[PDB]
Amino acid sequence: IPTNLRVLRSILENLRSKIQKLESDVSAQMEYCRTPCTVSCNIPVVSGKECEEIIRKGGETSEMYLIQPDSSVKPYRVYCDMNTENGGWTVIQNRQDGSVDFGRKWDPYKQGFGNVATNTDGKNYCGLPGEYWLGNDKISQLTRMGPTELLIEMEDWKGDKVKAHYGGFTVQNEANKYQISVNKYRGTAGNALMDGASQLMGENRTMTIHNGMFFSTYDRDNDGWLTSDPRKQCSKEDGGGWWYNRCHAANPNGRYYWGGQYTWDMAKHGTDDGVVWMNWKGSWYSMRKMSMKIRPFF
Amino acid sequence: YEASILTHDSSIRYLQEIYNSNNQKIVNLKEKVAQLEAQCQEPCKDTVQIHDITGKDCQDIANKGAKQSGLYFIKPLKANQQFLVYCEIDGSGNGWTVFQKRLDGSVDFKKNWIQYKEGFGHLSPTGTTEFWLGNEKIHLISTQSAIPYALRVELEDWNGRTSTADYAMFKVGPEADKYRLTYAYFAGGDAGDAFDGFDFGDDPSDKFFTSHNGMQFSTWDNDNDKFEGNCAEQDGSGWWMNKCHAGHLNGVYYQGGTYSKASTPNGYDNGIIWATWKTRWYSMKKTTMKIIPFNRLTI
Amino acid sequence: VIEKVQHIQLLQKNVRAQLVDMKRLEVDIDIKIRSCRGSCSRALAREVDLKDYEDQQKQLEQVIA
Ligand SMILES: *[C@@H]1O[C@H](CO)[C@@H](O)[C@H](O)[C@H]1NC(C)=O
Ligand SMILES: [Ca+2]
Ligand SMILES: [Ca+2]
Numbered sequence: 001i002p003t004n005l006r007v008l009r010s011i012l013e014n015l016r017s018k019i020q021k022l023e024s025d026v027s028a029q030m031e032y033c034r035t036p037c038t039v040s041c042n043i044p045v046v047s048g049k050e051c052e053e054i055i056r057k058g059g060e061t062s063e064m065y066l067i068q069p070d071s072s073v074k075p076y077r078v079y080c081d082m083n084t085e086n087g088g089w090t091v092i093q094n095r096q097d098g099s100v101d102f103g104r105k106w107d108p109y110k111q112g113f114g115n116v117a118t119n120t121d122g123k124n125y126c127g128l129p130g131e132y133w134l135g136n137d138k139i140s141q142l143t144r145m146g147p148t149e150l151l152i153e154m155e156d157w158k159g160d161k162v163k164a165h166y167g168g169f170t171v172q173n174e175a176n177k178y179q180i181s182v183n184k185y186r187g188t189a190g191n192a193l194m195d196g197a198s199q200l201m202g203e204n205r206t207m208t209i210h211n212g213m214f215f216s217t218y219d220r221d222n223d224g225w226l227t228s229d230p231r232k233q234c235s236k237e238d239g240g241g242w243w244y245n246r247c248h249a250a251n252p253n254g255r256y257y258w259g260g261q262y263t264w265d266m267a268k269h270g271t272d273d274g275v276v277w278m279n280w281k282g283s284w285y286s287m288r289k290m291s292m293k294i295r296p297f298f
Numbered sequence: 299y300e301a302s303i304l305t306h307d308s309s310i311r312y313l314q315e316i317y318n319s320n321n322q323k324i325v326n327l328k329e330k331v332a333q334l335e336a337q338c339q340e341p342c343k344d345t346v347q348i349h350d351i352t353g354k355d356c357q358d359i360a361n362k363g364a365k366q367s368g369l370y371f372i373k374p375l376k377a378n379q380q381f382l383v384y385c386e387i388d389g390s391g392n393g394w395t396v397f398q399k400r401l402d403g404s405v406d407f408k409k410n411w412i413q414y415k416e417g418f419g420h421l422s423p424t425g426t427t428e429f430w431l432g433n434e435k436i437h438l439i440s441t442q443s444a445i446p447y448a449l450r451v452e453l454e455d456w457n458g459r460t461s462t463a464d465y466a467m468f469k470v471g472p473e474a475d476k477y478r479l480t481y482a483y484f485a486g487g488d489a490g491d492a493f494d495g496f497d498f499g500d501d502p503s504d505k506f507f508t509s510h511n512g513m514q515f516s517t518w519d520n521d522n523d524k525f526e527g528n529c530a531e532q533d534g535s536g537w538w539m540n541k542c543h544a545g546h547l548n549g550v551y552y553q554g555g556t557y558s559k560a561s562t563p564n565g566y567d568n569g570i571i572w573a574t575w576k577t578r579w580y581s582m583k584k585t586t587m588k589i590i591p592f593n594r595l596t597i
Numbered sequence: 598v599i600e601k602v603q604h605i606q607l608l609q610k611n612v613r614a615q616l617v618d619m620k621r622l623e624v625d626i627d628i629k630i631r632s633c634r635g636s637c638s639r640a641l642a643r644e645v646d647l648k649d650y651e652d653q654q655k656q657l658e659q660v661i662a
């Protein structure tokens with residue numbers, strides 16, 4: 001009791017002010033949001049069914065393009081990586097800063113969200129990719145037009161990079177809960193989609209396998225967690241949508257924690273949401289960059 | 299310094315007054331945080347948007363109601379799919395479909411067959427970007443079932459003077475005939491008919507070596523000209539080369555407009571030239587090729 | 598245990614709680630604010646001080662026990 005009141009009183013008074021700071025910080029952002037951010041992306045002439053076709057048509061620079069995978073749907077914007085491994089890659093998911101919120105409900109993950117591309121210092125074309133999820137419906141159709149490979153790239157906060165390649169990748173339509181399938185793995189990042197978390201064994205590992213899983217968001221449970229507990233779900237509020245099992249070995253759509261390592265007292269729900277790829281940086285680490293690209297097989 | 303034990307009962311319940319108060323704020327702050335999040339779910343606003351009105355070409359669209367110039371999706375009758383184009387619309391109700399454009403040299407026009415066939419550059423709603431639509435598209439637009447098309451060609455020196463050259467019955471064949479350019483007659487224009495030929499005095503058949511009517515398109519990786527060598531390769535571009543040109547709008551963009559025989563390691567006249575309006579050594583500052591149904595070119 | 602000593606055993610948890618709670622909100626707001634970068638005219642540049650939160654937590658553990 002002696003020095004006890006001293007301590008507690010010092011903290012409660014301390015926090016009070018951090019609350020005062022935080023409150024201020026939010027007000028400043030509310031004011032900046034009275035207006036939007038903007039881009040001016042003049043559209044390239046060349047176009048195709050998806051990036052690979054474009055690059056075979058002469059589209060050799062990495063920038064935003066318009067593609068019409070099929071005459072039914074209307075042509076839409078996408079970013080094309082024409083430099084990485086012989087180019088022709090259609091980016092369907094990208095993380096590089098914390099610019100976009102990835103903890104969205106089922107619909108935003110169905111339709112898509114984020115910024116496909118941004119302008120590059122005095123330029124009429126958006127040559128840099130933003131952070132975005134192309135959209136489950138679109139991703140579904142793309143991986144179904146024919147054999148599709150998938151390239152996952154990531155980087156830690158120390159500048160290191162590792163890839164995860166998947167010879168075959170498909171995503172069923174909505175009515176089939178966008179079920180995922182992958183195979184022919186090869187890489188350096190570790191096979192977290194098919195095998196599961198490396199630091200695990202038996203059922204503990206096998207239950208962190210994404211391959212074959214259904215897609216779920218914090219407002220639509222399709223995870224491998226069968227029960228009645230209205231809380232034990234894999235995707236909680238602000239949680240990103242992914243192909244959750246019980247619950248994961250990797251999650252490219254997790255919350256973008258700054259710095260890398262994070263812990264249970266920082267996590268909104270104590271769970272380890274965040275740009276994780278266990279097989280590489282471990283359990284409570286969040287990548288600085290994380291992207292997903294597809295391309296016809298051959 | 300260690301006060302009265304009676305000060306305990308007091309301050310020991312005071313920390314509780316600033317504790318629950320803290321939780322209170324935290325509850326409102328979180329509510330405010332939520333509102334912030336709701337304001338941060340949108341994407342940045344893209345200035346460049348595309349109009350919904352579609353149609354066979356910029357004229358069809360114009361007639362359908364299109365009033366302003368910008369990007370549109372057209373789909374000629376025989377095309378397999380729709381493609382984006384820049385439509386120019388005047389207060390008269392005319393829908394020009396632009397396929398060539400120069401204005402700053404920001405785009406390199408030294409491309410190969412495929413690229414010239416598919417198209418390169420960028421399309422801007424404000425029609426302020428250099429591009430080449432693509433021979434296949436240009437072919438499709440100009441050969442729609444029984445619809446005579448016309449070609450207008452506007453130039454602009456680095457001094458504000460702009461000229462034009464109109465061609466009746468413009469047309470471009472399929473890849474099979476190497477996108478051959480053909481027109482019935484030079485519908486006039488102060489730019490002057492450079493597609494008919496131009497005597498430079500160099501040879502006794504300059505007029506024969508620089509005529510473009512009937513010529514097939516050529517690129518460095520696909521020579522279809524009327525010269526022993528490679529026009530497209532020498533001037534480093536893509537065009538309906540003969541042997542080689544009197545009118546060449548896909549030339550190298552020479553800043554300032556005035557270039558010389560000392561601008562290249564061979565002395566080639568590879569700039570944006572149009573012999574009848576300027577010397578073969580005056581590369582234009584702006585260029586623009588557009589087409590529209592002939593039955594629209596002023597009665 | 599006299600009433601006053603039980604009131605403190607209470608505040609000690611309440612505060613170690615509010616600490617973890619703020620520590621979270623701190624990271625939350627940080628992440629949410631950054632996410633506005635992709636939607637709003639600009640994102641409020643900042644950097645959260647997790648250290649002070651970690652230092653008070655230990656400053657508590659020690660005194661609680
Ligand atoms: C699986 O996880 C549980 C805790 O959830 C643990 O008790 C068990 O030992 C783990 N199984 C393994 C990998 O030994
Ligand atoms: Ca969210
Ligand atoms: Ca469940």
Ligand SMILES: [Ca+2]
Pocket residue numbers: 521522523524525526527528529
């Ligand atoms: Ca030749």
